[PDB]
Amino acid sequence: KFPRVKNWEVGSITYDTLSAQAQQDGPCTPRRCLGSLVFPPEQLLSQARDFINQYYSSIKRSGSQAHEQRLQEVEAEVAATGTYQLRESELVFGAKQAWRNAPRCVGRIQWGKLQVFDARDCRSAQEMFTYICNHIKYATNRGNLRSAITVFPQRCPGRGDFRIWNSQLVRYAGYRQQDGSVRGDPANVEITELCIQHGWTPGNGRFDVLPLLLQAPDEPPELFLLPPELVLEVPLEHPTLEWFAALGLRWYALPAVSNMLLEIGGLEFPAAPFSGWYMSTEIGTRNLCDPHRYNILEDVAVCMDLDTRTTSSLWKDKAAVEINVAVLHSYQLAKVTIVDHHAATASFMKHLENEQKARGGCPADWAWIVPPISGSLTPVFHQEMVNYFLSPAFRYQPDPW
Amino acid sequence: FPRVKNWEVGSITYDTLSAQAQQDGPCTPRRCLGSLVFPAPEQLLSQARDFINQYYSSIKRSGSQAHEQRLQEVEAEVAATGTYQLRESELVFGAKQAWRNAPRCVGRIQWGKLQVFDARDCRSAQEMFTYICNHIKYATNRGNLRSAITVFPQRCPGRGDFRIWNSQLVRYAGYRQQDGSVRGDPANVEITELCIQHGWTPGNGRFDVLPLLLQAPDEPPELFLLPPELVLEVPLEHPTLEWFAALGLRWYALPAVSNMLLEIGGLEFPAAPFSGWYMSTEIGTRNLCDPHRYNILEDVAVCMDLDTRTTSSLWKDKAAVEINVAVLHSYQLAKVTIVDHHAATASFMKHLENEQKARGGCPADWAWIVPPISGSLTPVFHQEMVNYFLSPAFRYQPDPW
Numbered sequence: 001k002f003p004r005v006k007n008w009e010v011g012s013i014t015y016d017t018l019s020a021q022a023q024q025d026g027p028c029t030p031r032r033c034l035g036s037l038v039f040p041p042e043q044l045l046s047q048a049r050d051f052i053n054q055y056y057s058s059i060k061r062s063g064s065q066a067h068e069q070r071l072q073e074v075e076a077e078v079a080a081t082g083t084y085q086l087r088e089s090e091l092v093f094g095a096k097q098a099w100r101n102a103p104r105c106v107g108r109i110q111w112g113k114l115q116v117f118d119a120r121d122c123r124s125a126q127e128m129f130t131y132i133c134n135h136i137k138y139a140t141n142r143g144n145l146r147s148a149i150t151v152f153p154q155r156c157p158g159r160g161d162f163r164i165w166n167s168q169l170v171r172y173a174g175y176r177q178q179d180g181s182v183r184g185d186p187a188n189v190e191i192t193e194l195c196i197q198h199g200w201t202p203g204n205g206r207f208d209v210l211p212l213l214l215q216a217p218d219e220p221p222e223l224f225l226l227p228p229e230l231v232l233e234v235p236l237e238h239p240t241l242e243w244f245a246a247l248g249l250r251w252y253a254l255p256a257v258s259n260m261l262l263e264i265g266g267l268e269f270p271a272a273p274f275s276g277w278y279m280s281t282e283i284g285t286r287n288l289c290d291p292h293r294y295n296i297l298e299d300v301a302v303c304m305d306l307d308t309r310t311t312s313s314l315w316k317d318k319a320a321v322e323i324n325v326a327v328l329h330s331y332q333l334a335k336v337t338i339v340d341h342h343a344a345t346a347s348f349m350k351h352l353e354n355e356q357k358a359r360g361g362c363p364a365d366w367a368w369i370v371p372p373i374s375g376s377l378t379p380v381f382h383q384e385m386v387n388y389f390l391s392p393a394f395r396y397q398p399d400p401w
Numbered sequence: 402f403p404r405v406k407n408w409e410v411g412s413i414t415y416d417t418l419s420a421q422a423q424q425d426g427p428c429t430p431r432r433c434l435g436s437l438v439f440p441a442p443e444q445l446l447s448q449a450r451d452f453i454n455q456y457y458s459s460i461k462r463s464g465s466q467a468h469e470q471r472l473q474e475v476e477a478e479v480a481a482t483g484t485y486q487l488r489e490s491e492l493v494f495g496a497k498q499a500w501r502n503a504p505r506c507v508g509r510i511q512w513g514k515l516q517v518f519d520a521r522d523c524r525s526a527q528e529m530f531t532y533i534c535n536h537i538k539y540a541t542n543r544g545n546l547r548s549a550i551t552v553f554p555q556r557c558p559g560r561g562d563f564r565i566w567n568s569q570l571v572r573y574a575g576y577r578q579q580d581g582s583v584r585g586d587p588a589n590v591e592i593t594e595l596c597i598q599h600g601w602t603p604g605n606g607r608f609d610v611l612p613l614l615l616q617a618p619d620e621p622p623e624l625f626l627l628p629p630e631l632v633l634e635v636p637l638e639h640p641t642l643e644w645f646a647a648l649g650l651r652w653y654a655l656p657a658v659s660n661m662l663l664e665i666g667g668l669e670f671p672a673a674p675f676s677g678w679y680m681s682t683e684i685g686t687r688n689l690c691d692p693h694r695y696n697i698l699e700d701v702a703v704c705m706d707l708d709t710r711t712t713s714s715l716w717k718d719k720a721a722v723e724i725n726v727a728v729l730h731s732y733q734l735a736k737v738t739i740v741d742h743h744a745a746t747a748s749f750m751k752h753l754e755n756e757q758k759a760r761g762g763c764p765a766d767w768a769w770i771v772p773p774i775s776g777s778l779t780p781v782f783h784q785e786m787v788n789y790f791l792s793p794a795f796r797y798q799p800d801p802w
C-alpha cells in the first residue's frame with residue numbers, strides 16, 4: 001500500500017507514503033491507466049478542518065491553543081454563514097501548498113518563494129485590472145521575474161464568479177483567413193474571437209498581445225487593453241544564425257496562468273492568476289514548434305539548409321534544438337529570467353529528494369515533468385513517479401461560457 | 402468508455418477495447434503508477450476459452466462447428482491432463498496477437514508480419530541453441546531484417562522451464578572494473594558474471610558479444626557461443642564528423658528479446674525469443690547516451706567543441722542528435738534495416754487508426770511510445786493513450802537465477 005519507486009539512473013529506491021493521502025480520485029483504474037489524458041452542502045467543513053490542520057502542523061503548532069481556537073472559528077463561521085474566510089497567513093500557506101502539490105509543475109523547487117497579493121476585497125472588472133496590472137509589473141520586475149499569485153474573492157453561493165477569460169494574462173492573437181488557417185497563435189483563436197466580439201480592434205500581426213476580458217460577478221465581461229509598457233517581450237534572435245532574427249519571432253516574458261481554480265480548505269477561487277518564469281522548452285519547443293501552434297519548425301529547417309526530404313536526417317530535431325537555443329539566448333540577452341530544461345529537471349530531482357524527507361513523497365506527473373525534447377537526457381526521465389491529487393490544489397475549470 | 406483526444410488535429414475517439422481488459426494494472430483512482438517500469442484448472446479454462454473465442458473470430462468462424470468442438474476439446478484436455486496443446490495456426494495467431502497487444506511497442510504497425518518458428522518439440526538445450534541460431538540467421542537476413550519469434554515448449558506440470566538467461570540474443574559484455582567502473586555495457590554486468598561463472602572466458606573489449614546461457618527443463622544453464630558470422634554488427638560513424646569513427650563504437654543489427662514470457666490462452670511459454678529491427682533512438686539515445694549505459698554524451702559533445710560548462714548551450718541536446726544521426730547513417734550505410742523515431746511514430750499513428758477501426762481501441766503506454774529525444778516533435782506526443790493489459794501477451798518474468 002506504499003508504492004515502491006525506483007530511480008533507474010542510480011538504482012535508488014523510495015516509497016511514496018504521501019500518496020496514501022490522495023483525496024480527489026484521479027482517472028486511473030486497475031483496468032486502464034489514463035495518465036496520458038490532459039483533462040481526465042457542508043462537506044466544506046471536512047476540507048476546512050483538514051486544511052487548518054495542515055497549516056498548524058506546518059508551523060509546529062498542532063494541538064496547541066491557537067489551533068483549537070481557529071478550529072472553532074471556522075466551525076462557527078460555517079454554521080453562521082455557510083462558508084468561511086481564510087486568515088491572511090493561511091491564504092499564503094494554501095497558495096504555496098497548492099503550487100507544491102501541482103503534479104505537472106517542474107518548477108516546484110521554488111514553491112516556498114511566492115508573492116501572494118490578497119485581492120479578496122475586490123469588486124468589478126475595473127478593480128481586477130488594477131490588481132492584474134500590479135501583479136504583472138511586480139512579477140515582471142524589469143525581467144528579473146518573481147513568482148506571484150493574486151487571489152480574487154472566493155466563490156460564494158447565489159452570486160456569480162470572478163473570472164479571467166484569457167487562459168493567460170499575456171496571449172497572442174489568432175486570426176483566421178479567407179482559408180480558415182490561422183495567423184498568430186492557434187491556441188487562442190477562440191479568445192481572440194471573443195475579444196474581437198466584445199469590441200477589440202484586431203491587428204493584423206502574428207504577435208498582437210490580446211486584451212483581457214475581465215468578469216466581475218453577474219456582470220458582462222469588460223475588455224481591458226494592457227499597458228504596452230507593462231507587457232515585457234523578448235524578440236527572438238539566435239547567437240550565430242544571423243537570419244533567425246529576420247523571422248520576426250517574439251515571446252513574452254511572463255507566463256501567468258489566469259484560467260485555473262485555486263482551491264484551499266474547501267474554498268474555491270476561480271480567479272487567482274499565478275505566474276513564475278518560463279522553462280525554455282515551453283516556448284522554443286511547444287509554443288513555436290507544435291504543429292497546432294506556431295509550427296515554425298520547417299521554416300527554420302529551410303533557413304538552416306537542412307534536408308527536409310527525409311525524416312532520417314533528423315532535420316526536425318536539429319531545427320528544434322536551434323530554436324530552443326535562440327529562446328535561451330534571447331531571454332538571457334534581454335536579462336529576462338528563464339531556465340533551460342536541463343537545469344529545471346535537475347532542480348526538480350532536488351525537489352523530489354527534499355519532498356521525500358519533508359513529506360514522504362511528491363505527486364509528480366511523469367509525462368509533464370519530462371521535457372518535450374531530449375527527455376531521456378534529463379534525470380527525471382529515469383525517475384519513476386507517483387501521480388495523485390493533494391489539497392490545496394490548482395484545479396482546471398470550465399471556460400466561463 | 403475513456404474519451405481520447407489527439408491534440409495536434411483535434412480528433413476524438415473512445416477506447417471501447419479497454420473495457421475488455423482482463424488482467425489488472427498498477428493504477429488506482431487514488432494514484433497513477435503509469436511510469437513504473439515493472440508495475441487452478443477453472444481459471445486456465447476461462448483463459449483458454451477466451452483465446453479460442455479470439456482465434457475463431459479472426460478466422461470468421463465464431464460460433465461454428467469447429468469452434469464448439471475446439472472448446473470441448475480444450476476442456477477435455479484440461480480435465481485429463483491439467484493443460485492443453487495449441488494447434489499450430491492457433492500458436493501463430495496467438496504470437497501475433499501478443500505482439501499486437503504489447504502496449505510499449507511502437508513497431509506494432511508490423512504486427513501481422515511475423516514469422517513464427519514452432520520449436521515446441523525442442524528436446525534439449527543443444528536443440529534450443531540450433532533453433533536460436535536459425536532464428537538469428539533468418540531474422541538478420543544479411544541486414545534486411547525480418548520479424549520472427551521462436552516458440553519453445555510451454556510450461557507444463559512435472560517439468561522445469563526452458564529459459565534463455567540472456568535478456569537478448571545479442572548482448573555486449575559488461576565487465577566490472579579494477580576501480581569499480583564498468584567496461585562495456587553496464588546493463589549486462591549480471592549476465593556477464595553468470596557467463597564467466599558458467600565457464601566463459603571473458604574478453605575485455607567494450608563490445609564483446611556474450612555467449613548464450615540456455616536452460617533445458619530441470620537442467621543447469623548450458624553455455625553456447627554464438628557463431629561470430631551469425632551476429633551482424635554495424636560500426637558507428639558519422640556522415641560529417643569523421644572523428645566519430647575513432648570512438649570505436651558498434652551496435653548489433655538484431656534486437657531479439659529473449660527473457661520475456663509469451664502467454665497464449667493461459668498457456669505460458671517462458672522461452673520464446675522475438676526480434677524485429679531497431680528504432681534508432683534505442684541505440685543512439687538510450688544505449689549510448691544513458692548515464693548508466695555507454696554514457697558517451699559528454700565525450701561526443703567535447704569532441705564536437707560544444708560548451709559543456711553550461712546547460713543552456715544545449716550541448717547535451719546537440720551531441721545526442723548527432724549520435725542519433727550517426728546511428729541512422731551507419732545502419733543505412735551497412736544496409737541494415739533501421740527506422741528513425743519520426744517514421745516509427747508516424748507509422749504507430751496509422752497503427753492506432755487501424756486498431757480503432759479493427760478493435761475499438763489500442764493499448765498504448767504513452768511514456769514508452771514517445772521517443773526519448775524530440776518527444777513533442779513526433780505525433781504520438783499529442784495523442785492521448787489508454788494503457789491496459791490484453792491477452793495474448795508478452796509478460797515480464799523473474800530472472801531464472
Ligand code: HEM
Pocket residue numbers: 095099101102103104105106107108110114147148149260274275276277278279282339344368394395
Ligand atoms: C517559477 C518558475 C516556474 C517554472 C519554471 C514552472 C514550470 C512549469 C511547467 C513547465 C509546467 C508545464 C505546464 C505546461 O506547459 O503545459 C507547469 C505547470 C504548472 N505550474 Fe509551474 N512553473 C513555475 C512556477 C509556478 C508557480 C509560481 C505556480 C503557482 C503558484 C505554478 C503552478 C503550476 C500549475 C498549477 C501547473 C499546471 C499543472 C498542474 O496543475 O499539475 N508554477 N509549470
Ligand code: HEM
Pocket residue numbers: 496499500502503504505506507508509511515548549550661675676677678679680683740745769795796
Ligand atoms: C519490427 C520492428 C519493431 C520495432 C521498430 C519495435 C520497437 C519497439 C521499441 C522502441 C520498444 C521499446 C523498447 C524499450 O525501449 O525498452 C519495443 C518494445 C516491445 N516490443 Fe517492439 N519493435 C519491433 C518488433 C517487435 C516484435 C516482432 C515483437 C514481438 C513479436 C515486439 C514486441 C515488443 C515487446 C513485448 C516490447 C516490450 C514492451 C511491452 O511488452 O509492452 N516488437 N518495441
Ligand SMILES: Cc1cc(N)nc(-c2cc(CN3CCC(F)(F)CC3)cc(F)c2F)c1
Pocket residue numbers: 107255256257274275276277278279282286287
Ligand atoms: C507559473 C507557470 C510557469 C511556467 N513556466 N509555465 C506555466 C504554464 C504554461 C502553460 C502554457 N503551455 C504552453 C505549452 C503547451 F504545451 F501547449 C501547454 C500549455 C500552461 C500552464 F498550465 C502552465 F502552468 C505556468
Ligand SMILES: Cc1cc(N)nc(-c2cc(CN3CCC(F)(F)CC3)cc(F)c2F)c1
Pocket residue numbers: 508656657658675676677678679680683687688
Ligand atoms: C523486438 C524488438 C524490437 C526493438 N526495436 N526493440 C526491442 C526491445 C529492446 C529492448 C532494449 N532496450 C534498450 C534501450 C532501453 F532504454 F534500455 C530499454 C531497453 C528491450 C525490449 F523489451 C524490447 F522489446 C525489441
Ligand SMILES: C[C@H](O)[C@H](O)[C@H]1CNc2nc(N)[nH]c(=O)c2N1
Pocket residue numbers: 035036037038367368369408782783784785786
Ligand atoms: C497526450 C499528452 O498527455 C499531452 O500531449 C501532454 C503530454 N505532456 C505534456 N507535458 C507538458 N509539460 N505540457 C503539455 O501540454 C503536455 N501535453
Ligand SMILES: C[C@H](O)[C@H](O)[C@H]1CNc2nc(N)[nH]c(=O)c2N1
Pocket residue numbers: 008381382383384385436437438768769770
Ligand atoms: C522511469 C521511466 O518510466 C523509465 O525511464 C521509462 C520511461 N519510458 C521509456 N520508454 C521506452 N521506450 N523505453 C524505456 O526504457 C523507457 N523507460
Ligand SMILES: [Cl-]
Pocket residue numbers: 255282283287
Ligand atoms: Cl506559454
Ligand SMILES: [Cl-]
Pocket residue numbers: 656683688
Ligand atoms: Cl537494445
Ligand SMILES: [Gd+3]
Pocket residue numbers: none
Ligand atoms: Gd542562404
Ligand SMILES: [Gd+3]
Pocket residue numbers: 641642643
Ligand atoms: Gd567534417
Ligand SMILES: [Gd+3]
Pocket residue numbers: none
Ligand atoms: Gd578518448
Ligand SMILES: [Zn+2]
Pocket residue numbers: 028029032033034035428432433434435
Ligand atoms: Zn495511471
